[PDB]
Ligand binder design. Structure first.
Ligand SMILES: NC(=O)c1ccc[n+]([C@@H]2O[C@H](COP(=O)([O-])OP(=O)(O)OC[C@H]3O[C@@H](n4cnc5c(N)ncnc54)[C@H](OP(=O)(O)O)[C@@H]3O)[C@@H](O)[C@H]2O)c1
Ligand SMILES: NC(=O)c1ccc[n+]([C@@H]2O[C@H](COP(=O)([O-])OP(=O)(O)OC[C@H]3O[C@@H](n4cnc5c(N)ncnc54)[C@H](OP(=O)(O)O)[C@@H]3O)[C@@H](O)[C@H]2O)c1
Ligand SMILES: C[C@H](N[C@@H](CCN[C@H](Cc1c[nH]cn1)C(=O)O)C(=O)O)C(=O)O
Ligand SMILES: C[C@H](N[C@@H](CCN[C@H](Cc1c[nH]cn1)C(=O)O)C(=O)O)C(=O)O
Lengths: 428, 428
């Protein structure tokens, strides 16, 4: 009956409301004031109101709203003490190791379940291997992705969040097939009316995330990298066609390639492959039936390389607008394409930060590169994504010697995580 | 020293100014008051001012401007009498036969040169065969296209025209290789600083028109045909992607197919094939080097079918905007794509007209279908374009029994033209 929620962002608050209303756990949450003015605003705000709040936008999601109070908000990870049966990781996947290793020996020995909300590929292996020094039979659970979109509308009230969308389908894998925990999640899922698919293992669920395959080619190329680190003369956009954005036959080739390096790795683990196009079309944003042939979507994996690229290119062109939106009187639809790049930025202590795109993709990609080596698999497109990103960081360093920079710029991070995957893989 | 110019549109007026300033011909022109309120406005306007005028927009085209007076404006074709050495066809290609057959026996016997300004594929054969009953050694000349863009700014002054663009390259073929006429055109071409390419025959020049390959798939499909004959709830556009316009993997397949049916026919006549993509890109509107690989443009004809379609699709997507135009401060370029469909319309005597797209493409396509049969070549995509167009006409007839309709709606036109090609082809 004790639960530790690592995160104080909108994901963590949404999940905390779910555990509050539909579980028997006493819930403690943990951010970082030792480290983050964002966490400190949240802590200060919760301290004042003594309540979090989830609101909703679409009323089909009633189950998820509610005002609530938790048992204990910890200010910083090191402050955590005592025993916790279940731990929920509602932070970024590149902090899972860093954050667990700060918990006490006493705390780590008590843990039976670690649930990973937004894992990358390989996150369960890292977390299973690290937890193995403390429990003997740790249960680790992976979702494909967070269940929807939650955000803070007002930065000044970060304890008040708004869930706007919910995903059509999530996946879920456990180190312990059909555990009590697994069945409790499933039951919970249908309370919330969220289609959930249970799959053989955590790895399997972690590969059912489109962003794995799409974010790296989209953000780790010279066009995107310039827009983020250097800036451009006129605004450019993530989803537009060159020169308005990065998308190009080249970019699409790099995506097919990285997709296949990935399906090589998953054949090794005997995990089914992903029909990337079907995923995209039947689970993210839909296109008109006239745009793509149902038989090409369905057989995507057996079709020729050039044809796969064609189909992908076409997918992106189809979503320049929202083809199901309400066109205005001139035949013009909503410019769904016009998503700006987030650029490098100085936090309130004047330190240069790299935004989540592509920071977190560096992490994801670095991990898949390291899995790759250990397994005897090639990854030249991955290697290329990383080279490009490492070069832009260095270039930023050379170009901005007078500015304070974050550890995100440094080489080569994730040693602990790499070691942990190394170790895990030796064993099986 | 007598020249007959058939046409009183802006093409004819531009060409008449050229002959006036740079030839030794007495120039007569001929329209149709028996038939056209457009021709009658022009005749009335010329009658009043006793002068035509070409103005220019870009000053790189000086040579082409000028005010001028011709020897005789005929009101109608049948009014033509006397002898003419040279005849210039500045009318639509589907009227060449109809209009020549109205001239007197005396006139037709005098003619030595017929110059065809905007021929379709097969136009020279039609005109050579028909002229063979009158001259014995008629010279027929074909250009790829008219030399640029001329228009009337003000409908009320249709004797005043504006040439806005000039083509990068035209082609030119004669039944009489390297004739005096051929050399006089070439000399004239460089006076005007218009790159001209001389090719082996008229047929050869007639296939160096992108519209031959592009207009039929773009306009003779259900989406386009609906927009023209029926209308749509919101405006749609010729060059946009579905659902904003017709362009679709399907449409692109139909274009590759019709392109190849065409290259089958041209192999028979031992005429070189057209690299459709190179034509498009290096001679019409240019795209950024990052959009297409130079090696793919260059080797286009030997590349796989699916890849050819990909490349074409990409070409069209690249020209949604003008990628060389001056983007505004939000990163947005000129919406070069937003060309409306011209719809069926009632002339001033309440008769329903079908616009040039796709009227003239019906003609072009009907001719290539007829060449096809006679030569023992397949054309199922052509047949399909025509079937579709014939069906929409009929549907229009069934749906608008209370409205006066033009002969453009009727089946099956061009018998004379077909017979003439039949005859020509038997002989060689
Ligand atoms: N709707 C969504 O926002 C959404 C949707 C899909 C997936 N996700 C993913 O789920 C995770 C949490 O989402 P969120 O919206 O709650 O984001 P967030 O507010 O940035 O939450 C991350 C939480 O972990 C902390 N943290 C620890 N180490 C961190 C590091 N290295 N970088 C950044 N934060 C770190 C953050 O502290 P501070 O608050 O002090 O920064 C915060 O409390 C993220 O990976 C996110 O990409 C979110
Ligand atoms: N810049 C351009 O406009 C341009 C560019 C490239 C190619 N072209 C082509 O060159 C030809 C002439 O161009 P234009 O701009 O001078 O067009 P236009 O004004 O419509 O000229 C066609 C001339 O021929 C007459 N005509 C005879 N039979 C006709 C028929 N069945 N349908 C339509 N007109 C007929 C027209 O009479 P009325 O004047 O009484 O209609 C007119 O005098 C057209 O085929 C056009 O597509 C034009
Ligand atoms: C913003 C960041 N990542 C999103 C992905 C957001 N990507 C979509 C993808 C997309 C493709 N076409 C239009 N939108 C977007 O840019 O809004 C997520 O994990 O759900 C996050 O975790 O909050
Ligand atoms: C309008 C008609 N046909 C044109 C073709 C015009 N087609 C272009 C082609 C195009 C492709 N992308 C943008 N424009 C257009 O629609 O303006 C010609 O023969 O030069 C004419 O003869 O005057």
């Amino acid at each position: 009956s004790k639960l530790l929620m690592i995160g104080t962002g909108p994901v963590a608050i949404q999940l905390a409301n779910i555990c509050y209303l539909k579980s028997d756990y006493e819930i403690d949450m943990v951010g970082r004031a030792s480290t983050s003015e964002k966490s400190k605003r949240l802590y200060q705000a919760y301290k004042k109101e003594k309540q979090f709040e989830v609101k909703i936008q679409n009323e089909a999601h009633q189950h998820l709203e509610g005002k609530f109070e938790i048992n204990r908000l910890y200010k910083d990870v090191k402050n955590v003490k005592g025993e916790y049966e279940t731990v929920v990781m509602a932070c970024t996947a590149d902090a899972y190791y860093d954050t667990l290793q700060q918990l006490s020996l006493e705390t780590l020995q008590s843990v039976k379940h670690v649930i990973l909300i937004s894992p990358t590929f390989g996150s369960q292996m890292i977390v299973e291997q690290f937890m193995s020094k403390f429990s003997q039979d740790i249960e680790v659970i992976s979702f494909s992705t967070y269940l929807g979109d939650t955000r803070i509308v007002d930065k000044e009230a970060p304890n008040h969040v708004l869930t706007t969308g919910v995903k059509k389908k999530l996946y879920m894998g456990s180190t312990h097939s059909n555990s009590t925990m697994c069945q409790r999640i499933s039951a919970l899922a249908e309370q919330l009316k969220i289609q959930l698919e249970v799959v053989e293992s955590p790895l399997h669920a972690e590969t059912r995330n489109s962003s794995l395959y799409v974010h790296p080619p989209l953000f780790m190329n010279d066009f995107s990298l310039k827009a983020i680190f250097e800036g451009t003369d006129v605004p450019v956009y993530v989803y537009k066609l060159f020169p308005e954005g990065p998308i190009t036959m080249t970019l699409i080739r790099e995506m097919r390639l990285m997709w296949k390096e990935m399906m090589a790795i998953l054949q090794a683990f005997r995990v089914p492959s992903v029909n990337l196009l079907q995923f995209m079309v039947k689970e993210n944003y839909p296109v008109r039936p006239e745009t793509l042939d149902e038989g090409d979507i369905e057989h995507f994996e057996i079709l020729p390389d050039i044809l796969q690229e064609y189909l992908l290119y076409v997918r992106y062109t189809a979503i320049l607008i929202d083809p199901f939106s309400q066109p205005d009187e001139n035949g013009h639809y909503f410019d769904f394409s016009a998503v700006p790049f987030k650029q490098v930025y100085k936090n309130e202590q004047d330190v240069v930060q790299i935004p989540r795109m592509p920071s977190e993709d560096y992490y994801r990609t670095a991990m898949i590169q390291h899995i790759g080596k250990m397994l005897g698999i090639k990854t030249p497109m991955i290697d290329q994504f990383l080279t490009r990103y490492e070069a832009s960081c260095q270039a930023y360093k050379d170009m901005h010697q007078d500015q304070q920079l974050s550890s995100q710029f440094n080489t080569n991070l994730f040693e602990g995580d790499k070691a942990l995957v190394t170790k895990f893989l030796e064993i099986n």
